[PDB]
Amino acid sequence: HMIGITQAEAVLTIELQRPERRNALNSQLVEELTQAIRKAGDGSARAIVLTGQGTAFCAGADLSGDAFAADYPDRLIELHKAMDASPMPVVGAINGPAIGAGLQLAMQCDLRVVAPDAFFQFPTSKYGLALDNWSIRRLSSLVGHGRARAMLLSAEKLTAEIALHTGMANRIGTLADAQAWAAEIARLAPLAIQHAKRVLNDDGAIEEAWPAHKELFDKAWGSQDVIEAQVARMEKRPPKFQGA
Amino acid sequence: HMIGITQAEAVLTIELQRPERRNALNSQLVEELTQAIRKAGDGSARAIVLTGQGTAFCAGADLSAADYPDRLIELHKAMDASPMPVVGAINGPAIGAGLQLAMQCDLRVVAPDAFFQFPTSKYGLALDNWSIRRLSSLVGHGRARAMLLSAEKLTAEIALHTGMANRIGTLADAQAWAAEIARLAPLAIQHAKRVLNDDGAIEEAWPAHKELFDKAWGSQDVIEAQVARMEKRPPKFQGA
Amino acid sequence: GSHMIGITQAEAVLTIELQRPERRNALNSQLVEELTQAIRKAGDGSARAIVLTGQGTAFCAGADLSGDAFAADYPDRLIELHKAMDASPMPVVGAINGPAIGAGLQLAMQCDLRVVAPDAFFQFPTSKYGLALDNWSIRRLSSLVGHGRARAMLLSAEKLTAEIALHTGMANRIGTLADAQAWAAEIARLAPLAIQHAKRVLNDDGAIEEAWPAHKELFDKAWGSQDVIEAQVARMEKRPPKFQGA
Numbered sequence: 001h002m003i004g005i006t007q008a009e010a011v012l013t014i015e016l017q018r019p020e021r022r023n024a025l026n027s028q029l030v031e032e033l034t035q036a037i038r039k040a041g042d043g044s045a046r047a048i049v050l051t052g053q054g055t056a057f058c059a060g061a062d063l064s065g066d067a068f069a070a071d072y073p074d075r076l077i078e079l080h081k082a083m084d085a086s087p088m089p090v091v092g093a094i095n096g097p098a099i100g101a102g103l104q105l106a107m108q109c110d111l112r113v114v115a116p117d118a119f120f121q122f123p124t125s126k127y128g129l130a131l132d133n134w135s136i137r138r139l140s141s142l143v144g145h146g147r148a149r150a151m152l153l154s155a156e157k158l159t160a161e162i163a164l165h166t167g168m169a170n171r172i173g174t175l176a177d178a179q180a181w182a183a184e185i186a187r188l189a190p191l192a193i194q195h196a197k198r199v200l201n202d203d204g205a206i207e208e209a210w211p212a213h214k215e216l217f218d219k220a221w222g223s224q225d226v227i228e229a230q231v232a233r234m235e236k237r238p239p240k241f242q243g244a
Numbered sequence: 245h246m247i248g249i250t251q252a253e254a255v256l257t258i259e260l261q262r263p264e265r266r267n268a269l270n271s272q273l274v275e276e277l278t279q280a281i282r283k284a285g286d287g288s289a290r291a292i293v294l295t296g297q298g299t300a301f302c303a304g305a306d307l308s309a310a311d312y313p314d315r316l317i318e319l320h321k322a323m324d325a326s327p328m329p330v331v332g333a334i335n336g337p338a339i340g341a342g343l344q345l346a347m348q349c350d351l352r353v354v355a356p357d358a359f360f361q362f363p364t365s366k367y368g369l370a371l372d373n374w375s376i377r378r379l380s381s382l383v384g385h386g387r388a389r390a391m392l393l394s395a396e397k398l399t400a401e402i403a404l405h406t407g408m409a410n411r412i413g414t415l416a417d418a419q420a421w422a423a424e425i426a427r428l429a430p431l432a433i434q435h436a437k438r439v440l441n442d443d444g445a446i447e448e449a450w451p452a453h454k455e456l457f458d459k460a461w462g463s464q465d466v467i468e469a470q471v472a473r474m475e476k477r478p479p480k481f482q483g484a
Numbered sequence: 485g486s487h488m489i490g491i492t493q494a495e496a497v498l499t500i501e502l503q504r505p506e507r508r509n510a511l512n513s514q515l516v517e518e519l520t521q522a523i524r525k526a527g528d529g530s531a532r533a534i535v536l537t538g539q540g541t542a543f544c545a546g547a548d549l550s551g552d553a554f555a556a557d558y559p560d561r562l563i564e565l566h567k568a569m570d571a572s573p574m575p576v577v578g579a580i581n582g583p584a585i586g587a588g589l590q591l592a593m594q595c596d597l598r599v600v601a602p603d604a605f606f607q608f609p610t611s612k613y614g615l616a617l618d619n620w621s622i623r624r625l626s627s628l629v630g631h632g633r634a635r636a637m638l639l640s641a642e643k644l645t646a647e648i649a650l651h652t653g654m655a656n657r658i659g660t661l662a663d664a665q666a667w668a669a670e671i672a673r674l675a676p677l678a679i680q681h682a683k684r685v686l687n688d689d690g691a692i693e694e695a696w697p698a699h700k701e702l703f704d705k706a707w708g709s710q711d712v713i714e715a716q717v718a719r720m721e722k723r724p725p726k727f728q729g730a
């Protein structure tokens with residue numbers, strides 16, 4: 001009910017359809033994606049394009065919110081496991097902003113073709129949250145350790161042009177461009193691609209949090225600053241965090 | 245008979261001389277190369293330039309033999325274990341085993357019309373882990389995915405951008421730089437090289453990696469890729 | 485008395501300024517000690533961020549144990565400084581106002597963020613002096629300028645300019661000390677716990693590595709080598725060195 005699924009040549013196009021929420025990921029959207037990924041090429045598709053309707057690729061977790069629901073991360077993790085395990089290369093057609101879980105989604109694609117007005121951001125430091133290790137590692141490999149530090153410690157927006165610079169974007173362009181590239185890739189040897197992908201994803205990005213990481217993570221998540229962050233936003237005022 | 249070795253002051257230059265096959269490696273040219281690396285600084289060399297004759301640095305492999313992969317493996321061990329900096333004068337296209345060899349150099353100067361490629365996904369093959377890890381460290385994880393999953397070329401300008409090329413220039417340029425390097429203190433260069441090479445790229449394949457590797461190599465698609473080329477037609481891969 | 489560093493605070497930003505401009509802010513045992521102390525005691529304190537910077541034309545030109553009374557426990561005093569920066573909950577924005585060479589480049593890399601002047605450069609000139617680096621300096625350099633350019637900096641003492649610092653990501657911005665402070669100010673209005681978590685994970689990328697056994701030997705040789713002696717002679721003599729590889 002919340003995604004579009006089409007196929008032309010051997011390219012499955014999976015489209016996030018919540019444009020009125022900038023494709024924010026609630027629980028239902030996350031389940032429907034997972035399913036669409038697992039059932040990709042049941043079936044004759046050799047590649048997937050993943051993209052969002054409207055002006056955003058994905059605005060992150062739904063602030064309504066599943067974002068702060070306790071069993072929401074597991075659905076996200078299962079989504080990511082499904083993409084990682086799929087033998088299909090996923091070309092992300094990033095048609096506009098990708099934030100939070102939405103950045104995570106974008107980075108879990110195998111390749112990225114990015115629209116000129118799209119940007120990338122982890123606003124974690126504005127909301128007092130904390131990321132899983134994989135997000136941090138993969139971001140570091142895609143924009144380089146220095147920019148990652150700036151994105152993670154200060155919520156720096158990564159522009160499209162700069163995403164093209166560091167490698168996070170492979171190409172700057174449109175959905176049609178992404179679909180055309182996926183067509184090429186769909187004509188390549190699948191076993192070679194499946195091998196590259198698996199080895200690539202096993203670069204060590206996938207990392208269980210160290211004990212200090214887990215403690216700092218929980219401490220951030222169950223902090224009062226989390227409340228203050230959303231309140232200041234809705235009240236359209238600056239936050240006053242207390243570090244607790 | 246297949247390589248040229250010369251020396252000017254402190255700099256040993258090793259030139260691939262199979263420009264008829266665009267310097268494609270085989271049984272012999274690799275084994276000769278291994279010796280040139282070992283028997284360098286035998287000798288008063290403090291720096292090696294590595295390069296290729298004609299239009300190509302090395303366009304891959306051409307075995308038109310059974311221990312070729314061994315000889316290839318030992319070649320890499322040699323450049324890795326070697327105590328001297330190797331400036332790759334990448335004079336033209338560096339493809340497959342050629343990109344492997346170019347990456348095994350400690351530094352790179354790349355001719356303006358040279359490019360780098362792993363076309364494995366056009367031929368249905370798989371790479372070892374080290375090639376993937378090091379390519380990732382040199383062109384960044386993002387561009388590495390595009391090279392690995394889509395067989396995309398890395399042009400010289402982007403090689404300079406990412407760090408794969410330290411400079412754009414000629415064999416002459418490489419030699420000029422290699423000479424300044426020969427004047428640097430060897431023990432410092434040795435320690436840095438060993439630690440740099442030990443960044444984790446020298447990695448043994450995970451089980452799933454090995455399953456997918458063997459699967460790709462023994463696939464029918466590998467034949468299809470070759471037969472399709474010979475028939476100037478598009479491949480129809482089965483994924484088997 | 486007097487100090488080798490200056491400490492001021494504007495709102496929640498603590499600016500620490502290295503003040504050995506006579507020596508281009510070359511580190512010694514006292515300066516390093518004063519710096520360690522200024523980092524632990526920050527945010528003790530209403531400060532939520534640290535701007536690190538150098539007085540004069542250089543950020544920090546490396547090391548100069550010359551007049552130093554306790555230059556003996558300078559290597560260990562240097563390890564302490566790096567742990568305190570790594571352990572600090574405060575994000576540290578280095579304002580690299582000039583050349584950061586050697587230990588100065590190590591210090592620069594231990595900062596959480598870097599705002600670099602247009603005339604600054606970065607350099608590990610260890611191959612000109614025949615020394616060896618610890619694994620962390622090498623790993624963290626690799627992450628900040630990419631593996632390719634890392635070999636070039638380490639094997640041939642290549643200078644990374646401001647402009648190519650921005651390119652690789654070594655320099656987050658090209659700006660002035662004020663610019664570094666305006667940015668740190670913003671960061672000081674962010675949520676400390678999120679920052680604390682990220683920094684700790686980021687520093688635990690693997691760059692903190694114990695030397696492999698083969699690494700230690702090459703390091704110990706390089707440092708015990710005659711060429712180290714030679715390279716100093718050749719400089720204090722004002723002439724090219726003749727390195728022997730021993």
Ligand SMILES: CCCCCCCCCCCCCCCCCCCC(=O)SCCNC(=O)CCNC(=O)[C@@H](O)C(C)(C)COP(=O)(O)OP(=O)(O)OC[C@H]1O[C@@H](n2cnc3c(N)ncnc32)[C@H](O)[C@@H]1OP(=O)(O)O
Pocket residue numbers: 020021022024025055056058059060061062063064067073076077080081084097099100101102104123129130131132134135206
């Ligand atoms: C093997 C696998 C290896 C990996 C393992 C798994 C890895 C994953 C594991 C993860 C598990 C760990 C924990 C998870 C950690 C991450 C979870 C939290 C991170 C988050 O995503 S939090 C949310 C952050 N996002 C934001 O704050 C978005 C801010 N900006 C915006 O929403 C928008 O302004 C833009 C997206 C930029 C677009 O702007 P615009 O076009 O001007 O639109 P606006 O006028 O602002 O909004 C239009 C309408 O959309 C609505 N909307 C926008 N965003 C959301 C949202 N996120 N949630 C709910 N509603 C949303 C907005 O309210 C508005 O509604 P209207 O007023 O009715 O028109």
